[PDB]
């Protein structure tokens, strides 16, 4: 009435995306199948890697479902479910991140034609949620209660599909010793902190019973100190050893000029009193989070006392557990008993960077190896490969469960699901059998990357499960199919349980969605 136009009131804002119809949920499935296609050829040892460069021109080379999806800023809402399960699988277990993604995409891709039919959404979710309960129980029967024979074999399989798989003869021998230093019920991940060294060859690495940290600063009296101590003693400090303000303030009134000379000498008196208390206990190695001034390091440089600074708190916490000492933020409360010790000390040239080596302790909680390589991605790939393998042998100590690898777990579970679907209820026979053949995507693509024909493989797996009761899987060496127990290929069961639970939770999340709202 107040205007000749009379505009029609739109419900939502301008620019909001479309709504209900035909093809809304199918677009979310095709969006997941699109992301699933990129991670498709990266499966198994005979796969490939993915090269990505973001907007900031940071090069990265990897074949991990979490790392590839982390750098890619995914804006599609349904596609970020794959990002969440990858980080959830990477945070806890650290292996098989991909096998969780290429599996959830197949369940959603297998749910595509059922959604085109008149099947409701809840019927498909009830099938997977009822079938995954039997798959978890079936994997408990596939897994063994192994206790005999007292780590070595589990690490070789976790290093697959990336760089150090071929060098497993050298890296697995020292990687097993990394977790044996850690005792039960603690399992501290920060003690396995490893740093970057651009330059060198990966073969020249070695095992270290302690820590090796960069100094990150050149002091005036650094060269005067000896680099080799026969019986060193470590003492960790936190007080700032330099001439400056004492406690967060600076204001000094002086009336007489005779006392003006004494107040300056008092500052010189207390700073050497602070340093002399460190000298009297016989601490050869001095370490502090805060900076150390030139006055202190030259006082230590005269009488053969090494010192260093500019280190992080995470590095300091690794130093205490390696030497077995403690933190002392006051020089007056220093006692002889709290000083850590080791066998020897030697500063070595490593990639044009100096590192203070500690090794030979009788009881060390720390394993820290120097990663040297040609490119910055080589040292990064060796880190992620070891970080994924160290989690497997870490949790192998927590519980002793072993299942057959090479896609053998998926086939044995699928056969019982076909028997369970054959028996009862009629309607869900198509859904469970659809879940069965969709679960076989792991050995499907594992052989396609090997160059073998999938029909001859998949026909041999099904008809040979009777004599191949449980340990029946693929073998890449002889170009044939046989028992995996003789080949000594092992893998834990925790990757399989979390994969199906995360994949079943991922597909059921957006299967209960038929809408998409995007404001602005």
């Amino acid at each position: 009435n107040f205007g000749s136009q009379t505009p029609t009131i739109v419900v939502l804002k301008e620019g909001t995306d479309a709504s209900q119809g035909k093809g809304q949920i199918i677009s979310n499935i095709n969006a997941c199948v699109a992301v699933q296609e990129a991670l498709k050829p990266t499966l198994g040892p005979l796969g490939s890697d993915i090269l990505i460069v973001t907007s900031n021109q940071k090069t990265t080379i990897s074949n991990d479902g979490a790392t590839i999806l982390k750098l890619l800023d995914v804006v599609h809402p349904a596609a970020k479910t794959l990002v969440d399960i990858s980080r959830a699988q990477d945070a806890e277990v650290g292996d098989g991140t991909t096998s969780v993604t290429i599996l959830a995409g197949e369940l959603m891709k297998e749910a595509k034609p059922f959604l085109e039919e008149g099947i409701s959404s809840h019927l498909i979710m009830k099938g997977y949620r009822k079938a995954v309960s039997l798959a978890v129980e079936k994997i408990n029967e596939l897994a063994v209660d192994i206790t005999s024979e007292k780590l070595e074999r589990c690490a070789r399989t976790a290093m697959s599909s990336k760089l150090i798989h071929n060098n497993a003869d050298f890296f697995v021998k020292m990687c097993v010793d990394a977790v044996l230093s850690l005792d039960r019920n603690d399992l501290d991940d920060k003690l396995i902190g490893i740093k970057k060294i651009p330059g060198g060859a990966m073969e020249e690495s070695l095992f270290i019973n302690g820590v090796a940290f960069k100094k990150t600063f050149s002091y005036a009296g650094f060269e005067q100190q000896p680099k080799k101590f026969n019986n060193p003693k470590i003492l960790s400090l936190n007080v700032e050893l330099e001439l400056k303000a004492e406690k967060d303030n600076a204001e000094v009134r002086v009336e007489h000029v005779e006392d003006y000379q004494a107040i300056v000498d008092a500052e010189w008196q207390l700073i050497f009193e602070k340093l002399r208390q460190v000298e009297e206990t016989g601490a050869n190695i001095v370490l502090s989070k805060l900076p150390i001034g030139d006055l202190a390091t030259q006082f230590f440089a005269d009488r053969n006392i090494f010192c260093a600074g500019r280190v992080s708190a995470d590095d300091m916490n690794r130093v205490i557990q390696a030497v077995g000492g403690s933190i002392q933020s006051t020089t007056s409360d220093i006692k002889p008993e709290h000083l850590g010790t080791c066998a020897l000390f030697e500063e070595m040239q490593i990639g044009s960077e100096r590192y203070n080596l500690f090794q030979g302790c009788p009881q060390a909680k720390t394993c820290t190896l120097l990663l040297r390589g040609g490119a910055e991605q080589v040292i990064a790939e060796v880190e992620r490969s070891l970080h994924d393998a160290i989690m497997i042998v870490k949790r192998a100590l927590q519980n002793k469960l072993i299942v057959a690898g090479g896609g053998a777990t998926e086939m044995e579970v699928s056969k019982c699901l076909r028997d369970y679907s054959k028996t009862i209820a009629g309607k869900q026979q198509m859904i469970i059998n659809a879940f069965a053949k969709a679960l076989e995507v792991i050995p499907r693509q594992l052989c396609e990357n090997a160059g073998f024909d999938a029909i001859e493989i998949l026909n041999k797996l099904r008809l040979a499960h009777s004599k191949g009761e449980k340990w029946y899987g693929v073998v890449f060496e002889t170009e044939n199919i046989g028992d995996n127990f003789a080949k000594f290929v092992w893998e834990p069961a925790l990757v399989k349980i979390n994969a199906l639970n995360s994949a079943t939770e991922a597909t059921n999340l957006i299967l209960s969605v038929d809408e998409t709202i995007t404001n602005k």
Binding site: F2, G3, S4, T6, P7, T8, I9, V10, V11, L12, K13, Q20, V75, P77, K80, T81, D84, I85, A88, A91, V93, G118, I119, S120, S121, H122, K126, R129, N185, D189, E246, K247, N249, A250, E251, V252, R253, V254, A262, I263, D265, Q269, L270, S326, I327, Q328, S329, T330, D333, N498, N501, E505, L509, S512, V513, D514, E515, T516, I517, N519
Partner: protein, 548 residues
């Protein structure tokens, strides 16, 4: 002829202002504007309801099946639709249960009102019709009630309460999700049987901490609480029994600096020598009175200094950061400690009791646990919720808030007063309200009649979302109520309802053995606020907007 005069005397108001009167079918358009988002609610009610993706301008996504939650993020232009947003927001704040109903009922009252206004009924009579129907609706809800709880704590009774509530939001498996709530409700309640004390319960007591990884079956019920903190000095498993003591300080563990220009002043060298050692001896002397009381863990409220930390970890005193007000208050309720801001001796009566403080790897990050034991129970327990997708953690967490909100419904009224669910409570009111229309004379009878027709949406929605044909399932259910109460007592035709999965025909095998019911307090305010949503939209005949 080439151009109109374009609404003269339009300069009375600005060009951006527009009027919208009842004529020109605009009230029909407002009903159609409700119909746009109301159909979105059809596929979100019930156990087979489908969640919704809502991508905000910031990119924060929340996937959900609940009305009140989804309507917060959507920016709405139509004011009549915003009445439903604030009506459902009132439903979530007060009762925390029955928000789709507020949306699906009040939208259908406007739908059937589209037929009434088109027939020629005045708007004043329409409000009088639903108000007279509301007084009869709330009256009969108290009459057809069956069953009661009568016990605050029981293993089997809580399965009847929590399970029908969380069945709508993230149904999944029934037992693994219901046991996490029924175990946590028993921990926080002050039972105190045979004392005559007033019960008390807080919604903020039970709180869920989201941790990625794991699976839904690995979720456990923690007696205490949890944060993602790191001890500063050292970590301790604390295998020593003979329980430790707890002292809570809200001020930082440091020297109480002067609020007005705290600056050093040293006139001579004698003060320079003693000022460095004076701070060490002063901080040490304050820790002696604290350490002699046998305390081994202190929860700090703000940043702690390094000198104070050096004397705390000397005697093995754990340090915990809680840099906020509510995070510090929730922890005192567990151990039952009374904080004091002074840095002196904690009082022995005020010291808390915690047996063990463990630090283990759950989500890959460092977390600190405060599990109590059966002896010396505590309140404000937490639930470790494990899942793969962060979006699913958000909706399951709000399902616990809805379940915890349902436990609040037992404290204020005299008891439980459960009703039959699965559409049985809605379909019974259709016959009672229809009979009420026949008893009253006047032109308001059509308003009473259409009020009953609006209640068919609950069985029609559950039959549509369940993948069944509503034309056959709905009238098959009417046969149970068209055979009305014969001369025999103890008639069991009231428990007939719809069924999502199973037998043909659909009248469910009772909602009985199934153990699904509804709360009276939810239905009272839901029908009240839903009628107010339709009252305010139908009572207004002119709408004025600005800038659009």
């Amino acid at each position: 002829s080439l151009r109109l005069p374009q609404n003269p005397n339009a300069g009375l108001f600005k060009q951006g202002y527009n009027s919208y009167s009842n004529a020109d079918g605009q009230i029909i358009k407002s009903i159609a504007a409700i119909r746009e988002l109301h159909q979105m609610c059809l596929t979100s009610m019930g156990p087979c309801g489908r969640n919704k993706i809502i991508v905000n301008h910031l990119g924060k996504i929340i996937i959900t099946n609940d009305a009140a939650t989804m309507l917060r993020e959507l920016d709405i232009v139509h004011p009549a639709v915003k009445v439903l947003v604030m009506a459902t927001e009132q439903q979530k704040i007060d009762m925390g249960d029955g928000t789709n109903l507020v949306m699906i009922l009040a939208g259908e009252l406007l739908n059937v009102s589209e037929k009434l206004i088109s027939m020629g009924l005045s708007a004043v009579e329409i409000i009088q019709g639903y108000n007279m129907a509301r007084k009869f609706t709330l009256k009969e809800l108290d009459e057809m009630v069956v069953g009661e709880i009568t016990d605050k704590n029981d293993k089997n009774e809580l399965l009847k309460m929590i399970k029908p509530v969380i069945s709508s939001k993230k149904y999944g498996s029934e037992d693994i999700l219901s046991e996490l709530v029924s175990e946590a409700v028993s921990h926080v309640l002050p039972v105190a049987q045979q004392a005559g004390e007033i019960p008390y319960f807080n919604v903020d007591s039970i709180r869920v901490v989201k941790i990625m990884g794991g699976s839904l079956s690995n979720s456990t019920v923690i007696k205490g609480m949890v944060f993602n903190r790191e001890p500063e000095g050292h970590v301790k498993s604390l295998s020593e029994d003979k329980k430790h003591k707890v002292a809570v300080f809200t001020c930082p563990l440091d020297i109480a600096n002067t609020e007005t220009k705290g600056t050093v002043l040293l006139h001579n060298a004698q003060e320079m020598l003693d000022f460095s050692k004076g701070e060490e001896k002063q901080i040490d002397a304050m820790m002696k009175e604290i350490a002699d009381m046998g305390v081994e863990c202190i929860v700090a409220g703000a940043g702690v200094g390094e000198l104070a930390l050096h004397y705390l970890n000397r005697y093995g005193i754990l340090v915990l950061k809680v840099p906020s007000k509510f995070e510090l208050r929730r922890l005192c309720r567990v151990c039952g400690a009374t904080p004091l801001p002074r840095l002196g001796a904690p009082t022995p009566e005020e010291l808390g009791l915690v047996e063990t403080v463990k630090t283990m790897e759950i989500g890959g990050d460092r977390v600190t646990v405060f599990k109590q034991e059966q002896g010396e129970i505590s309140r404000t327990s937490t639930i470790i919720l494990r899942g793969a997708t962060q979006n699913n953690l958000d909706d399951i967490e709000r399902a616990i808030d809805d379940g915890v909100a349902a436990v609040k419904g037992l404290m204020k009224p005299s008891g439980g007063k459960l009703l039959p669910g699965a559409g049985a409570t809605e379909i019974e009111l259709i016959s009672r309200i229809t009979k009420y229309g026949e008893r009253t004379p006047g032109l308001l009878q059509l308003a009473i009649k259409q009020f009953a027709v609006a209640f068919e949406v609950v069985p029609r929605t559950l039959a549509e979302t369940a993948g069944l044909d509503v034309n056959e399932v709905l009238p098959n259910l009417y046969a149970a109520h068209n055979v009305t109460e014969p001369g025999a007592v103890k008639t069991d035709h009231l428990y007939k309802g719809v069924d999502i999965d199973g037998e043909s025909d659909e009248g469910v095998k009772d909602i009985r053995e199934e153990n699904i019911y509804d709360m009276l307090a939810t239905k009272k305010f839901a029908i009240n606020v839903a009628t107010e949503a339709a009252t305010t939209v139908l009572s207004i005949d002119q709408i004025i907007m600005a800038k659009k």
